[PDB]
Tab-separated table of C-alpha atoms in Angstrom:
chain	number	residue	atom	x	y	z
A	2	UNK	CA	57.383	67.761	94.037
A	3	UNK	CA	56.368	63.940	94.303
A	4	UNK	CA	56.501	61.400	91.910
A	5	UNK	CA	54.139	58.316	90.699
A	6	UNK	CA	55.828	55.184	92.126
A	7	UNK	CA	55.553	51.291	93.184
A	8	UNK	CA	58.158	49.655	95.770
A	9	UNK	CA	58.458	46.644	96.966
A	10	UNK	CA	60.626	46.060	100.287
A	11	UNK	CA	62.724	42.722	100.663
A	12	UNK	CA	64.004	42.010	104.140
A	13	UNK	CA	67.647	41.325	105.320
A	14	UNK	CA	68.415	38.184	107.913
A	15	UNK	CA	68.206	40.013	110.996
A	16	UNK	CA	72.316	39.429	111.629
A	17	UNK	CA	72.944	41.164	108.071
A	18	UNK	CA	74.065	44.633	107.804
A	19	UNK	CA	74.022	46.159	104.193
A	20	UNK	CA	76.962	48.216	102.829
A	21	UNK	CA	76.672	48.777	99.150
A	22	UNK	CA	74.458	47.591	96.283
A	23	UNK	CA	75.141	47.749	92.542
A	24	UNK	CA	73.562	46.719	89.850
A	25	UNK	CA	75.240	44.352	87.259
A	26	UNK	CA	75.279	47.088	84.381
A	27	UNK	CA	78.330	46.283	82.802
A	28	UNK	CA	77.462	42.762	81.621
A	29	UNK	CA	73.751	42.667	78.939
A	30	UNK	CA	73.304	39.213	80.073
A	31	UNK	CA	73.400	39.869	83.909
A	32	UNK	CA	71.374	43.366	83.618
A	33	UNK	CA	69.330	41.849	86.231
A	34	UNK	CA	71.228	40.654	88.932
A	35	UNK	CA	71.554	43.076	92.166
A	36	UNK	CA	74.536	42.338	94.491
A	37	UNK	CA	74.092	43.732	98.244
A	38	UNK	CA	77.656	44.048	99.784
A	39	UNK	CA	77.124	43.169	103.947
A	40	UNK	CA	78.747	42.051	106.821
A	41	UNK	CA	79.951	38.512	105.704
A	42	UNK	CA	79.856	38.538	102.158
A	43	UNK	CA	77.521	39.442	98.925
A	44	UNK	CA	74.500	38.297	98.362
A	45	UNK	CA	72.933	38.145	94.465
A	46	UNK	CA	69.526	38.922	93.940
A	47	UNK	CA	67.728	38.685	90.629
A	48	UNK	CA	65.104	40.866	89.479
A	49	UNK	CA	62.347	39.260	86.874
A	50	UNK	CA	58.940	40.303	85.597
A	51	UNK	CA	56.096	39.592	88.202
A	56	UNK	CA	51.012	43.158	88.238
A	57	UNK	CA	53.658	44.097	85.975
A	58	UNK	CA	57.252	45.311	86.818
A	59	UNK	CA	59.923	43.880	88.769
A	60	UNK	CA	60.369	41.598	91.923
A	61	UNK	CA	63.691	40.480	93.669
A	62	UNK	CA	64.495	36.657	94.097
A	63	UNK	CA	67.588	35.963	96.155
A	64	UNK	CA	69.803	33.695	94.481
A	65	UNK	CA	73.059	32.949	96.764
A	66	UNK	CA	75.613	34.429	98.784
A	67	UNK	CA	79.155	34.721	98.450
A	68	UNK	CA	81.025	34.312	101.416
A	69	UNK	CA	84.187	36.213	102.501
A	70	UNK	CA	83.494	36.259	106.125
A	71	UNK	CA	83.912	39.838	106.642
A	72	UNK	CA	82.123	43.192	105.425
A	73	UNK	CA	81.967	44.473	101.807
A	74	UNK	CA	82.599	48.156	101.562
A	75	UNK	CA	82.734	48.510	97.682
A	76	UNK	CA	81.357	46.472	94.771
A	77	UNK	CA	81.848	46.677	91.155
A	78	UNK	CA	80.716	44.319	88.180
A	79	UNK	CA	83.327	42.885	85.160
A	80	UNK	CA	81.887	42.541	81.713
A	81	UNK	CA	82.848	39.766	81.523
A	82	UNK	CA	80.183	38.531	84.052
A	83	UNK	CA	78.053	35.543	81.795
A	84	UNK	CA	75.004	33.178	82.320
A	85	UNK	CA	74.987	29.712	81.561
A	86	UNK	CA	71.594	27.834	81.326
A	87	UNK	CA	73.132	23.937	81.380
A	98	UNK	CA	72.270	23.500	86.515
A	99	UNK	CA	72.199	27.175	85.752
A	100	UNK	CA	75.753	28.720	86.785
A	101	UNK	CA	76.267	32.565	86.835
A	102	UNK	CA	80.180	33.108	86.239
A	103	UNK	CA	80.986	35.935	88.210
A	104	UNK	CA	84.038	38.223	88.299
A	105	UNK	CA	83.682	41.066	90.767
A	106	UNK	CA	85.945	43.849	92.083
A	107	UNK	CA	85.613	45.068	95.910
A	108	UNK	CA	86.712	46.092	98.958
A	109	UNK	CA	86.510	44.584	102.470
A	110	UNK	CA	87.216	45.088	105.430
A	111	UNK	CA	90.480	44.479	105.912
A	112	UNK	CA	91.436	47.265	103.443
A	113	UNK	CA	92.459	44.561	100.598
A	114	UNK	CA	91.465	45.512	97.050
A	115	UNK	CA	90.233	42.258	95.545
A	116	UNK	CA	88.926	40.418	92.793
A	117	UNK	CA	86.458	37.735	92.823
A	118	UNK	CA	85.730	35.412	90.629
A	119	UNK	CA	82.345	32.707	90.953
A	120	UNK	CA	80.938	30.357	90.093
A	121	UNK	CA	77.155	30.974	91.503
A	122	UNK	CA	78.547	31.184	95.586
A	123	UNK	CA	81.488	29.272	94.959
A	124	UNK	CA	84.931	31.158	94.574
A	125	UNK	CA	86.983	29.633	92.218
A	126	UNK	CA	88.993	31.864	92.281
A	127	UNK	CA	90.336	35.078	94.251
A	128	UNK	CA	93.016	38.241	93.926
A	129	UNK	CA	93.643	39.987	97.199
A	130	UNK	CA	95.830	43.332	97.315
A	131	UNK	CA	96.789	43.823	100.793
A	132	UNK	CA	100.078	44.008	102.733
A	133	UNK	CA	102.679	46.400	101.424
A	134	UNK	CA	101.603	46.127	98.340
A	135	UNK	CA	98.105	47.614	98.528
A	136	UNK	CA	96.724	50.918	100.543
A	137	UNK	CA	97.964	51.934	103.873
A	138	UNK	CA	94.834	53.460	104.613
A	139	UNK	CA	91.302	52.994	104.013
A	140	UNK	CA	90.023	52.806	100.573
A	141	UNK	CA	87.581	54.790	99.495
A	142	UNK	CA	86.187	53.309	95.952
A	143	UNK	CA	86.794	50.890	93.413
A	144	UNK	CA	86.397	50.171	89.593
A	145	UNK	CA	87.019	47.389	87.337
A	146	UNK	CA	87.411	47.402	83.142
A	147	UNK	CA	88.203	45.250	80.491
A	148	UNK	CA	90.631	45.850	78.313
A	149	UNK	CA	91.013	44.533	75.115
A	150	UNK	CA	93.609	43.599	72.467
A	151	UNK	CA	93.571	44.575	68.557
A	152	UNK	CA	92.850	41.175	67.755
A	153	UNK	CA	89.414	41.153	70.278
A	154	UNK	CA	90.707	39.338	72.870
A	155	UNK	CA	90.565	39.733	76.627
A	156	UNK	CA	94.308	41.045	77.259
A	157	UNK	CA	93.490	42.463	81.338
A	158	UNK	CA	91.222	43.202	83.396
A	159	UNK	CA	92.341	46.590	85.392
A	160	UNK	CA	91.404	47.506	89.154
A	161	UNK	CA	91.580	51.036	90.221
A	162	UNK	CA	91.228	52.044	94.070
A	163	UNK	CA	91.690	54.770	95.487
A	164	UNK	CA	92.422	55.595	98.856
A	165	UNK	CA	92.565	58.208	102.430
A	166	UNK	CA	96.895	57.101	102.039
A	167	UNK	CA	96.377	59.303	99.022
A	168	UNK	CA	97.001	57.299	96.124
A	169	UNK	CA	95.481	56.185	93.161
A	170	UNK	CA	96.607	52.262	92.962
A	171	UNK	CA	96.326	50.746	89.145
A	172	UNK	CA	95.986	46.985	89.597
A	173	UNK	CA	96.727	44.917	86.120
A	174	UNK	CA	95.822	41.315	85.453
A	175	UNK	CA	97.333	40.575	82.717
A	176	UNK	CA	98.375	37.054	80.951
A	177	UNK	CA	101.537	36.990	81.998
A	178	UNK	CA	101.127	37.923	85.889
A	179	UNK	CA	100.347	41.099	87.698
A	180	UNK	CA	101.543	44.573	87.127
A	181	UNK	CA	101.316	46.949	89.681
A	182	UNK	CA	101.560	51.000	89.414
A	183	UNK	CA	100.562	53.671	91.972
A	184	UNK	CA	100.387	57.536	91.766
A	185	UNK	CA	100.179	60.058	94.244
A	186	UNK	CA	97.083	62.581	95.001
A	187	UNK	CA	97.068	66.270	97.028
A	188	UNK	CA	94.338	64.582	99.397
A	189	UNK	CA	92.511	61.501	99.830
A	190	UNK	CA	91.206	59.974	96.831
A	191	UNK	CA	87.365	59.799	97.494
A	192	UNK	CA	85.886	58.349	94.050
A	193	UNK	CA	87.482	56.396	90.597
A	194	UNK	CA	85.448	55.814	87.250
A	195	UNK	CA	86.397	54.099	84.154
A	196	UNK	CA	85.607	56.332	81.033
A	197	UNK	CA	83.073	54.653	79.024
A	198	UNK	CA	83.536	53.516	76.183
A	199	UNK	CA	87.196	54.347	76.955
A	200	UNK	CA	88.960	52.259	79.419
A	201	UNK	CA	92.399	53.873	78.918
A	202	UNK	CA	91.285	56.492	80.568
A	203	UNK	CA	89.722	56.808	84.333
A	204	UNK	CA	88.141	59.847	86.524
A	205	UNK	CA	89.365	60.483	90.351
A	206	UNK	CA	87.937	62.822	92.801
A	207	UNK	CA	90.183	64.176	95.394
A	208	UNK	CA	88.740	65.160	98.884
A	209	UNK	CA	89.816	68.466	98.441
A	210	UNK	CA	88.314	69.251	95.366
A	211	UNK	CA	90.533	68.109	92.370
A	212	UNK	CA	89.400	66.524	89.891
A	213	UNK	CA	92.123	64.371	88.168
A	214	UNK	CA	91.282	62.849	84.293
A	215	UNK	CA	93.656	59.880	83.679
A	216	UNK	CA	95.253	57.757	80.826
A	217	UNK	CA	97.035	54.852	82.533
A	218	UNK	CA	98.431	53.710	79.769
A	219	UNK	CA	100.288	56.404	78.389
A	220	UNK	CA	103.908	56.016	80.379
A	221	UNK	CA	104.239	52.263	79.825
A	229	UNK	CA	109.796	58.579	83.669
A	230	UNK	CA	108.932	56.765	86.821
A	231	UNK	CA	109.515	59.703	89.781
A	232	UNK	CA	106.417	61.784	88.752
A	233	UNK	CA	104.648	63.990	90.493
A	234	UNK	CA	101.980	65.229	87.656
A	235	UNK	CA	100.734	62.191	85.844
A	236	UNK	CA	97.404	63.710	84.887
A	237	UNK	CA	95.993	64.528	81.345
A	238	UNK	CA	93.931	67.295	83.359
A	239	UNK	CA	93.179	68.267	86.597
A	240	UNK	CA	89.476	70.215	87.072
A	241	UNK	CA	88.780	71.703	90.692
A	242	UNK	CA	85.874	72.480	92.212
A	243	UNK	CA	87.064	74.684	95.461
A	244	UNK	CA	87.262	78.224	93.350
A	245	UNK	CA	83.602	77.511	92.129
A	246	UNK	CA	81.990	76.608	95.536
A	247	UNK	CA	81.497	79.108	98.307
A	256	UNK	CA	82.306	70.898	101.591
A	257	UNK	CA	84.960	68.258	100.987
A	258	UNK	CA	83.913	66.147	97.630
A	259	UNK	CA	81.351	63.572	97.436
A	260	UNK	CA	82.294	62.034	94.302
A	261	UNK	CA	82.472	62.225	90.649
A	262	UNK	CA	81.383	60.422	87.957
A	263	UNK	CA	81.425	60.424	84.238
A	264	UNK	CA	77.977	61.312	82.409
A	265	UNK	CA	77.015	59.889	78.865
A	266	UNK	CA	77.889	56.795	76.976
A	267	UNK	CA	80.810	57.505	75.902
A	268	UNK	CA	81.791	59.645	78.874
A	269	UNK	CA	81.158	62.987	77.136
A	270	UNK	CA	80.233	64.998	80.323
A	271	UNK	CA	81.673	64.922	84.385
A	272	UNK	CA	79.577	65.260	87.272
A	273	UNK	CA	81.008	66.476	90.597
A	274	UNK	CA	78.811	66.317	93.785
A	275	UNK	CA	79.828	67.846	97.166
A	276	UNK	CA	79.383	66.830	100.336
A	277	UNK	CA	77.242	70.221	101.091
A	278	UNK	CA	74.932	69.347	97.877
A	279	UNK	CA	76.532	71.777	95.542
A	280	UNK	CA	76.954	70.186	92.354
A	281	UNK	CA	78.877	70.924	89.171
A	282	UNK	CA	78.766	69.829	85.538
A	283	UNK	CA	81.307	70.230	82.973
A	284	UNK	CA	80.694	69.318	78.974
A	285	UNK	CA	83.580	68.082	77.050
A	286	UNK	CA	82.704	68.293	73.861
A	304	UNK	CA	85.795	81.666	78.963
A	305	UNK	CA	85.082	77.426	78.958
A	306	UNK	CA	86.897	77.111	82.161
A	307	UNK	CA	83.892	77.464	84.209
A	308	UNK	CA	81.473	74.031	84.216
A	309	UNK	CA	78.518	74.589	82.080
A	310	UNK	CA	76.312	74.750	84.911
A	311	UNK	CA	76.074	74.421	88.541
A	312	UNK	CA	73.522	74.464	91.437
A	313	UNK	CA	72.723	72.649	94.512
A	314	UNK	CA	70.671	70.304	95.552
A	315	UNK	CA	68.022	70.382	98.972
A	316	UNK	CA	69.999	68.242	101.091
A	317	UNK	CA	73.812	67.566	102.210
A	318	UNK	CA	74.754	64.210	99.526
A	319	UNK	CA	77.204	62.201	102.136
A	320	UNK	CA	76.834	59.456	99.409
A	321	UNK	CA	77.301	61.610	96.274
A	322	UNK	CA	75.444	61.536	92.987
A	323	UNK	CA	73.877	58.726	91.329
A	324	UNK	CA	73.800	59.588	87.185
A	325	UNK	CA	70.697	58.232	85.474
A	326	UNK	CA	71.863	55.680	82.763
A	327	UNK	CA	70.174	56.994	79.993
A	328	UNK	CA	69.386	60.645	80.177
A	329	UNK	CA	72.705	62.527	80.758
A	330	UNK	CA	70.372	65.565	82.242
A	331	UNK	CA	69.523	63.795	85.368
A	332	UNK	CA	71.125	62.448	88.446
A	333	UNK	CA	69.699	61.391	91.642
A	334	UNK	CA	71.378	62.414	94.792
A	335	UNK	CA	70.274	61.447	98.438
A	336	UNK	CA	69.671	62.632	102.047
A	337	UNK	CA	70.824	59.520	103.345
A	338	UNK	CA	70.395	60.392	107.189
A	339	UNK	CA	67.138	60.922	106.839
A	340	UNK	CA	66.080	58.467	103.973
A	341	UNK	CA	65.163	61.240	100.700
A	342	UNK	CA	66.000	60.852	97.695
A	343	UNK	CA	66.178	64.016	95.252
A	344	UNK	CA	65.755	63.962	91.836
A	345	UNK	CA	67.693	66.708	89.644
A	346	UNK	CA	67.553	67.771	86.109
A	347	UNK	CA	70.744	69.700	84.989
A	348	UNK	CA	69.408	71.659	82.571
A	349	UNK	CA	65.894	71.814	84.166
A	350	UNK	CA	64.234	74.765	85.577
A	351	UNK	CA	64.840	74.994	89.617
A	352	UNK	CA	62.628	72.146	90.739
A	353	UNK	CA	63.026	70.520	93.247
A	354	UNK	CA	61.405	66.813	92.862
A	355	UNK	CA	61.605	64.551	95.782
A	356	UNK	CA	60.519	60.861	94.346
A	357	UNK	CA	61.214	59.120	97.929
A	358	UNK	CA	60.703	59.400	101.313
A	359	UNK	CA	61.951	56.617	103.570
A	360	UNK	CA	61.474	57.897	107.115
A	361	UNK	CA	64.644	55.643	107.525
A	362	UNK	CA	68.343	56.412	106.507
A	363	UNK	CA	69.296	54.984	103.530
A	364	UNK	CA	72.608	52.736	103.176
A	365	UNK	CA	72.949	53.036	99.545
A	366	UNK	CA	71.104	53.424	96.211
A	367	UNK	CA	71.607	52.390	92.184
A	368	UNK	CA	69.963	52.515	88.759
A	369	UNK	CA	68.647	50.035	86.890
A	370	UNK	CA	69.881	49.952	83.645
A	371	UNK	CA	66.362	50.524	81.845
A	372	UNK	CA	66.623	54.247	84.343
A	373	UNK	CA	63.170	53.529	85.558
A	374	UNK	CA	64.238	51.203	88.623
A	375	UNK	CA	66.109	52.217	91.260
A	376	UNK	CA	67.604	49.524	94.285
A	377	UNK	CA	67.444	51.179	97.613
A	378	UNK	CA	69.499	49.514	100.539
A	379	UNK	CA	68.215	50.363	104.133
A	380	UNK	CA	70.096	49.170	107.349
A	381	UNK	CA	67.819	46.413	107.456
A	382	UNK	CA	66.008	45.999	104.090
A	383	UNK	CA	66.711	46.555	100.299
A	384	UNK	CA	63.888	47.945	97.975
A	385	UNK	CA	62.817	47.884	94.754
A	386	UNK	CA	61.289	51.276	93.460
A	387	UNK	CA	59.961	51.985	90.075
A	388	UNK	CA	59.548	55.519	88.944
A	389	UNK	CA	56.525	55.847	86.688
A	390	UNK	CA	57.828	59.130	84.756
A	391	UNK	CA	60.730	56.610	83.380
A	392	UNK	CA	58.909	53.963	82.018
């Protein structure tokens, strides 16, 4: 099954090599800037109305000087029309395995965290996520990092007013994937490569030697008969988790015999990348055949369909939604598109 589409394809420089790209979601204001993660920095693109629908218009790059692995907007992102400056604060991961947060001012870093050394992972890292956390009186009391890593442990990075506080908690395996709940940011998702699924509050021990820390562990190995892909939370207010395998077997549990997920299946390709949820409709996700540059798009509770919006002929690098769920950012080794699904709109 196909899908009514327009794309648009923006070229790399030749000497850049995409990683990651991300939409910045998490800040109303910034909805349309796209960051591209690559060998020597990230570079912000911003999308704006042309016919109709949307074109990309690089803005600047950040340097770092070597590759970004993992990206993740703050809230607390903002736009200033004075000399227009975009105040950035992004969470990633380089190269170097440091966990880091940067904060801009349009290129220019003002201002940067790095996690390295003893005190960060030992091993790669695997993912990366970044919330705001506020105080009673509506302030901005921290801004919390969570990575996750192959040394198998989840690392909680604080930023609070008064210095850094640092915490880290062991997994069975490798920790593959970490989400924020939203609407929640107490509490955070991580999948294991093994299969566990461990649900988080961070902030409930604040009793040090502790082996189980976890509100709940789910696990996906006694349901699927192949290491995890990722998994993500699904609605607004984080009401639903989706777990992806590596094989394309996917699983979805609703939160509110309910110990098996509420449904399973699995999609036409391996997902090396994982699932991608759609931001508005908690039914579908898009997964990808990144070798071979398809993209899938799957329904939950829809009949056995199998609808394949895009077909690169290329691999694909990396993939997002738009927040408006009818855009979707493609990265390609050498090109990033833009790709509006008709059916969304």
């Amino acid at each position: 099954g196909s899908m009514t589409l327009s794309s648009n394809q923006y070229q790399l420089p030749l000497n850049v090599r995409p990683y990651t790209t991300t939409w910045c979601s998490q800040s109303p204001s910034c909805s349309n800037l796209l960051a591209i993660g690559h060998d020597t920095g990230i570079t912000i693109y911003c999308a704006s109305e042309e016919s109709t629908g949307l074109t990309l218009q690089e803005l600047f790059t950040i340097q770092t000087g070597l590759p970004t692995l993992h990206l993740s907007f703050s809230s607390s992102c903002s736009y200033s029309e004075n000399s227009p400056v975009y105040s950035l604060f992004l969470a990633c991961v380089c190269q170097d395995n440091t966990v880091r947060l940067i904060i801009t001012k349009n290129e220019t870093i003002i201002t940067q965290h790095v996690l390295g050394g003893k005190s960060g992972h030992h091993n790669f890292v695997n993912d990366i996520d970044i919330a705001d956390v506020y105080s009673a009186d509506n302030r901005l009391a921290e801004q919390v990092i969570a990575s996750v890593g192959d040394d198998c442990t989840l690392i909680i990075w604080r930023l609070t007013d008064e210095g850094p506080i640092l915490a880290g908690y062991p997994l069975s395996s490798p920790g593959i994937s970490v989400q924020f709940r939203p609407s929640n940011p107490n509490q955070l998702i991580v999948g294991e490569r093994n299969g566990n699924i461990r649900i988080f509050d961070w902030t409930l021990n604040l009793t040090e030697l502790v082996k189980n820390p976890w509100l709940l562990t789910l696990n996906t190995l006694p349901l699927v008969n192949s290491s995890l892909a990722n998994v993500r939370w699904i609605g607004s207010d984080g009401s639903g988790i989706l777990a992806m395998c590596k094989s394309g077997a996917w699983l979805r549990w609703n939160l509110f015999k309910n110990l098996l997920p509420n449904v399973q299946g699995i999609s036409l390709f391996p997902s090396l990348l994982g699932a991608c949820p759609h931001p508005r409709y908690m039914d579908y996700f898009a997964t990808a055949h990144s070798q071979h540059g398809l993209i899938q798009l799957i329904n939950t509770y829809e009949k056995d369909s199998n609808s394949i919006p895009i077909q690169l002929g290329m691999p694909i690098v990396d993939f997002c939604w738009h927040q408006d769920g009818s855009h979707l950012a493609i990265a390609t080794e050498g090109s990033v598109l833009l790709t509006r699904l008709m059916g969304f709109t």
